[PDB]
């Protein structure tokens, strides 16, 4: 028979069916057995494949493998052997996340009487033993410990029952290791620094507390579905295999381990009093639920409608407040630092598919969550706040921008620079970009008027209002005529010669003021205007000062239209009017200092860095862009600190929070690349001479792979 049919059978088992899961498992067990003489090879590969790609269905497949071992001991043996080869093969290729699933699969296979407990206990001893290796990354020790502890919810009970002394030994070693671990990375990964109402915990300290509780509860957990408990008679009489001694692949220069993590947490049972009791933060139930949901998304993130269906149809031993769990997991992904598992916009539309699926329940939970997120803004990290802003505004544009703003009137009386009032402004500005100025003015209460974005109107220095005394006034009005008359590049140069020279700044000013003003109708006009007179630009801004002056004038022309500012910079860089370096220096200039804490400023800087990243060959220019950025960050941050030392004022000001966290963001958003420049940075910029406040960001960043 076609191998395609075999794959379909194995992939579909466990899904929606009229017959019971047990019945279907036994059924498939038969089919798989009969096709062994001719397709054993294919079957081995398929079972190994779902074991590492379909973790959310773990116990479904271990049970199947269990039933098969009972029927054909030798087959079971070759499956385990294949699994171990795959595990090594996966570790070898730095696919540690995939490896963990293989490890949980082997673990659960013990409950299926396919692997003798003693073999697993030994393999785990060699795992924890890695924490004793010398001269290796903490992230290497972490992974082996994590792979061990995260297997306990499945096989913890059985292992403790067969080798409690051995396990007590492994635990002791694990605890002493977790006690000496470095926690430098934590401040950089927390979504909130506040430990109230929910502390954002380091993933290993949290998982350990969960395991401790499980142990105290005599290894009894009430969530995991275990199909195999229904085949006790069949499985409790199968011959169990013994695993060979497992030696973890030594650390090498090529080894890349997962970064450490911090557990996102915003809910507890009190947030849903009349629903099923929500498992606590330190219960393995909360861990397994979120792990499964995260995996569901990983498997279906490309098909939003299907993804929402799978999340909502998530099965469990006991009922839990699923909607709260789903919503929490999605925000845990959107707000994950350094970055989310998938593209940001996906979470926005996924939430909408979930709303269409559960119209009577999901929407309330989401609104509730939105309220809680807003009320906890004061200590939320800047990178997460941005995503919050971008999500919420985009979300609103899909529901006619309807929202009970009066619910956040508390922000009206606060300091404008405060997280809450700033969040509202940034959101309203975002809403205008997806709509229009009047639309936003009409959707908010009169009390929020001030928080609304100013009308994105262009500003022409030589318009009606202006006096004729202004330098270049005549040349400007002259250029206006020339432009309306389709003048050429040569004609424009000639008109500009009538300008005195204080690199000529005035030439640039009059040229950019007038050109932009006449193309203010749309982005396409401005774009075509930049292209047509591309020659005048390259000549007038051949020098760095020139490029810098172009940006300065362009900013004076469109300071009320942030979106226009951004698309103009992007186009000027792509067509070489200016380069990334200039844009970077422009970001930290005096003319932009009053807008330094606004979102558009950093959106432009990051779009600039990404363009430089996609530029092959120009690796020298790439490193220099980063050097420039960090250099300016250190200058302004230092300046602030020195002045606070003198004037005797507090360092923790709203301005400081932004700047320090924006520096942090540079690392987070480009951690992958900056890695190669890491060394040079430590030698020339982030030296021991730096103020600890600044050096700390650099060290927390390194902690991600230490």
């Amino acid at each position: 028979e076609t191998e395609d049919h075999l794959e379909s059978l194995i992939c579909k088992v466990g899904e929606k069916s009229a017959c019971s899961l047990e019945s279907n498992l036994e059924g498939l067990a038969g089919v798989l057995e009969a096709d062994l003489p001719n397709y054993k090879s294919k079957i081995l590969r398929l079972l190994c494949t779902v074991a590492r790609l379909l973790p959310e269905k773990l116990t479904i497949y271990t049970t199947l493998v269990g039933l098969l071992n009972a029927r054909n001991y030798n087959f079971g043996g070759e499956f385990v052997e294949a699994m171990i080869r795959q595990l090594k093969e996966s570790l070898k290729a730095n696919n540690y996340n995939e490896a963990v699933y293989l490890v949980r699969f082997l673990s659960d296979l013990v409950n299926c009487h396919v692997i003798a407990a003693p073999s697993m206990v030994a393999m785990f001893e060699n795992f924890v033993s890695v924490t004793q290796e010398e001269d290796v990354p903490q992230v290497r020790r972490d992974w082996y410990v994590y792979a061990f502890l995260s297997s306990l919810p499945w096989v913890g009970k059985e292992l403790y029952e067969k080798k409690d002394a051995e396990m007590d030994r492994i635990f002791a070693n694990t605890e002493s290791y977790l006690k000496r671990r470095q926690k430098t990375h934590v401040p950089m990964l927390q979504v909130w620094t506040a430990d109230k109402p929910h502390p954002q915990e380091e993933y290993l300290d949290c998982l350990w507390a969960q395991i401790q509780k499980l142990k105290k509860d005599r290894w009894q957990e009430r969530h995991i579905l275990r199909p195999y408990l229904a085949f006790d008679s069949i499985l409790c009489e199968a011959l169990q295999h013994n695993l060979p001694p497992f030696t973890p692949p030594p650390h090498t220069e090529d080894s890349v381990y997962p970064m450490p993590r911090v557990i996102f947490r915003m809910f507890d049972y009190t947030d849903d009093p009349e629903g099923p009791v929500m498992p606590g933060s330190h219960s393995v139930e909360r861990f397994v639920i979120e792990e499964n949901l995260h995996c569901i998304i990983k498997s279906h993130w490309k098909e939003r409608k299907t993804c929402a269906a799978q999340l909502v149809s998530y099965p469990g031993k006991n009922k839990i407040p699923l909607n709260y769990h789903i919503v929490e997991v999605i925000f845990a992904e959107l707000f994950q630092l350094p970055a989310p598992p998938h593209i940001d916009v996906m979470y926005t539309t996924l939430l909408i598919e979930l709303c269409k699926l559960q119209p009577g329940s999901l929407p309330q939970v989401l609104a509730q969550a939105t309220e809680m997120l807003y009320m906890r803004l004061d200590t939320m990290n800047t990178t997460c706040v941005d995503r919050f802003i971008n999500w919420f505004s985009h979300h609103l544009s899909n529901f006619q921008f309807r929202w009970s703003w009066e619910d956040w009137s508390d922000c009206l009386s606060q300091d404008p620079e405060s997280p809450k009032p700033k969040f509202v402004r940034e959101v309203l500005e975002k809403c205008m970009r997806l709509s229009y100025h009047q639309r936003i003015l009409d959707i908010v209460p009169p009390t929020f008027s001030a928080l609304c974005p100013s009308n994105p109107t262009c500003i022409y220095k030589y318009g009606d209002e202006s006096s004729n005394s202004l330098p270049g006034h005549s040349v400007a009005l002259c250029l206006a005529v020339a432009f309306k008359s389709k003048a050429t590049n040569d004609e424009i140069f000639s008109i500009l010669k009538d300008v005195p020279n204080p690199f000529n700044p005035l030439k640039i000013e009059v040229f950019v003021q007038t050109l932009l003003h006449l193309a203010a109708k749309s982005f396409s006009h401005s774009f075509s205007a930049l292209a047509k007179f591309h020659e005048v630009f390259k000549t007038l801004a051949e020098s760095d000062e020139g490029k810098l002056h172009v940006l300065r004038v362009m900013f004076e022309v469109w300071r009320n239209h942030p979106q226009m500012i951004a698309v103009l910079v992007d186009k000027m860089i792509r067509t070489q009017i200016v380069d990334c370096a200039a844009v970077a220096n422009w970001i930290f200039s005096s003319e932009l200092s009053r807008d330094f804490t606004r979102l558009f400023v950093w959106e432009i800087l990051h779009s600039t860095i990404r363009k430089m990243n996609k530029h092959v060959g120009a690796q020298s220019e790439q490193k220099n862009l980063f050097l420039v950025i960090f250099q300016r960050f250190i200058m302004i941050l230092t300046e602030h600190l020195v002045r606070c030392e003198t004037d005797g004022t507090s360092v923790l000001t709203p301005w400081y929070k932004n700047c320090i966290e924006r520096l942090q963001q540079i690392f987070l958003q480009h951690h992958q690349i900056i890695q190669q420049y890491m060394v040079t940075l430590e030698n020339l910029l982030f030296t021991a001479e730096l103020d600890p406040h600044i050096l700390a960001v650099f060290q927390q960043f390194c902690a991600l792979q230490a």
Partner: protein, 149 residues
């Protein structure tokens, strides 16, 4: 090893639409559609601006250019546009997450396009607008009221 089930990417699949003006063999049209970085966007409001389209579509990646659909006669916005990305991957995410969501309060529809060519920015309807709007029956305020002819 991999699984066919996990390859599912239905939102990125080609639709039924085929440009009846395309100068070439259908095979060559699909060949272009499969490597295209350009998307056709439909059901826009006549008051929907290019700036609004930039804000929405930039969520899936960097936009190279946007071309607004114009009434072949009065040369005004007639309800559709073309969004061209620098990379296929960003064009795919727009098909995955922007297609079928709101813009100017309307559910828009995106579709792969073989590529822009002069004259393609104009409605092919007899009255100048989009064919769809020629014999319409409903009263769509954001689309010029009744369906012309």
């Amino acid at each position: 090893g991999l699984l066919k089930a996990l390859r599912s990417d239905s939102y990125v699949e080609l639709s039924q639409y085929r440009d009846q003006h395309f100068r070439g063999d259908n095979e060559e049209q699909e060949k272009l559609l499969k490597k295209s970085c350009t998307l056709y966007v439909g059901n826009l409001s006549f008051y929907t601006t290019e700036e609004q389209i930039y804000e929405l579509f930039s969520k899936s990646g960097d936009i190279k250019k946007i071309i607004m659909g114009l009434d072949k006669m009065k040369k005004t916005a007639c309800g559709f546009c073309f969004v061209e990305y620098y990379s296929r991957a960003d064009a795919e995410n727009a098909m995955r997450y922007i297609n079928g969501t709101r813009l100017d309060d309307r559910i828009i529809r995106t579709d792969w396009d073989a590529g822009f060519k002069e004259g393609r920015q104009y409605g092919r309807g007899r009255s100048g607008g989009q064919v769809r709007d020629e014999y319409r029956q409903d009263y769509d305020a954001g689309r010029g009221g009744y369906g012309k002819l």
